[PDB]
Amino acid sequence: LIPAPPLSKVPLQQNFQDNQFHGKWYVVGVAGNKSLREDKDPWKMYATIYELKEDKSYNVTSVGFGTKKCHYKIRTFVPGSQPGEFTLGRIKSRPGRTSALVRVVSTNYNQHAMVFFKVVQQNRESFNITLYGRTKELTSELKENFIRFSKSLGLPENHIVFPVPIDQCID
């Protein structure tokens, strides 16, 4: 586990606009602090829909393809300490569960976003940077920039994955 960077190293998108970040995004890159065993099945692209509600939370629905069937994951992101930051969950961690901090590093709303997450699940800590696109196409100059940003947070290139584009389940 590479240690998570201090939040002073993680930019926050200026003048974040929640109603423009709304909608469907594909997970087109991920860089995270664990592992990566080459002896596996390739990680398939999935989609996340951020639906902004009048109470300024997002209802966040992911859809993806397993082996044979579609899967869904639904949860709420609530505004954090400043615009572009969120935490997981309406009520803070019930019985035994997951907590997360979310910071939108950069977005232009109609093409891509880079979003930093720190997560605890079953007392285990991890972090990732997720690269989102409004379309599935990922070109080389954006792959290069995502690798550079990931390296700036302490992650080397072997911890960076560009999920395989697929048609099942996600559109």
Partner: peptide
């Protein structure tokens, strides 16, 4: 399936 984000 949901290997990124939260």
């Amino acid at each position: 399936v949901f290997f990124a984000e939260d």
